[PDB]
Design a protein around this ligand. Structure first.
Ligand SMILES: CN(C)c1nc(N2CCCC2)nc2ccccc12
Ligand SMILES: [Cl-]
Length: 390
């Protein structure tokens, strides 16, 4: 650990639209806001006009451009981007102060990929080469940065949700957090770092062993928590959970928050819920705890999130006083996805060199006077490798 003072407060954005870092590409430098995505492995940037892009990468204006003369087709969940592969010199201004040659995918066509008014123009895929496209021989950005410079094979992410909804303009003002490249910044967390092993180097896959709602165990075969696979994914908004796990949690959260009642749509993430300015009854909503496999035999540790995390602020401007929120937990056929919602509670260390992911309580996590996110351990769990789906 130490102090990485230029890289602190370098991200902007929100859970609904993603978090981005300023990068430059080419000679002379072309500035672009790039989404930080731990759930993919391509460095891909808008390279042609699009209604939602205010600017883009212009290969014709860069002396250091080289065409790799291959195309790339990445289907997204719904829609796609299509790219022309190449290489160019790449920097991060509020970054490690080193320029590297990297594979860049010049996006030329795309559908349902860019977000309207998002203020990012590309994607920095930080995952491993195994899920890069067209295949693993395309070296990802981070692999290249390590090999070309002296930077340690490790990065860390502090995503900072504000307590309230942010406009298009306010996202640029409001600080969104920190990506630390090549290290761990001691001032971005309190208490201790607890590490879970990375199960496989493709996505950042982890093993969840136990789940609690206000200390109340969900009491399932822990294969159901990792049903298919569990991942840490900055490019996903919600905490996504498998079907059986999702329903059991919703029932448990409903019951704990029974002081009030909410429509069925709220629990399916569609309808807003709204209280008067400041009177959000956080105390009636329960904390959610995920136990992760520790790197010692028969040890787990616990990350605990608040309703401040799993209820995203979203404005309506129908009575502009009210504080409104959407339910930021949802169903998955992927297995568990620990999106921005979860990550906004914690400082997450991606220790690729030692094949593990660290968790600590974020200094910027949103909370009231009487509660706070936690990272706690150890806990003697038995048969934790049987929680893995294989
Ligand atoms: C930031 N997340 C939520 C993303 N949203 C969308 N939008 C969802 C509706 C249209 C596109 N596209 C992405 C593409 C890559 C990585 C993250 C995201
Ligand atoms: Cl989502």
């Amino acid at each position: 650990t130490g102090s990485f003072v230029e890289m602190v407060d370098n991200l902007r954005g929100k859970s609904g639209q993603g978090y981005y870092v300023e990068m430059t590409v080419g000679s002379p430098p072309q500035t672009l806001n790039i989404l930080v995505d731990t759930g993919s492995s391509n460095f891909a940037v808008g390279a042609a006009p699009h209604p939602f892009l205010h600017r883009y990468y212009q290969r014709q204006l860069s002396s250091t451009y080289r065409d790799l003369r291959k195309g790339v087709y990445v289907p997204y969940t719904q829609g796609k981007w299509e790219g022309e592969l190449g290489t160019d010199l790449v920097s991060i201004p509020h970054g490690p102060n080193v320029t590297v040659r990297a594979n860049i995918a010049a996006i030329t066509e795309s559908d349902k990929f860019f977000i309207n008014g998002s203020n990012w123009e590309g994607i920095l895929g930080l995952a491993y080469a195994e899920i890069a496209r067209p295949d693993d021989s395309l070296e990802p950005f981070f692999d290249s940065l390590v090999k070309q410079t002296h930077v340690p094979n490790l990065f860390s992410l502090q995503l900072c949700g504000a307590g309230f909804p942010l406009n298009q303009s306010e996202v640029l003002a409001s600080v969104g957090g920190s990506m630390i490249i090549g290290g761990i910044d001691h001032s971005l967390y309190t208490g201790s770092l607890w590490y879970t092993p990375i199960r496989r180097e493709w996505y950042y896959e982890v093993i969840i062993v136990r789940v609690e709602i206000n200390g109340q165990d969900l009491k399932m075969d822990c294969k159901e928590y990792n049903y298919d696979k569990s991942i840490v994914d900055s490019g996903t908004t919600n905490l996504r959970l498998p079907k059986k796990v999702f329903e059991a949690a919703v029932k448990s959260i409903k019951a704990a928050s029974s002081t009030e009642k909410f429509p069925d749509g709220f629990w399916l993430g569609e309808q807003l819920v709204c209280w008067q300015a400041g009177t959000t009854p956080w105390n009636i909503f329960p904390v959610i705890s995920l136990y992760l496999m520790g790197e010692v035999t028969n040890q787990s540790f616990r990350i605990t999130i608040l309703p401040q995390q799993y209820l995203r602020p979203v404005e309506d401007v129908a009575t502009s006083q009210d504080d409104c929120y959407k339910f930021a937990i949802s169903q998955s056929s992927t297995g568990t996805v620990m999106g921005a919602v979860i990550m906004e509670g914690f400082y997450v260390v991606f220790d690729r060199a030692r094949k593990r992911i660290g968790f600590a309580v974020s200094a910027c996590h949103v909370h009231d006077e009487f509660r706070t996110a936690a990272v706690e351990g150890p806990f003697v769990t038995l048969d934790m490798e049987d929680c893995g789906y294989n």
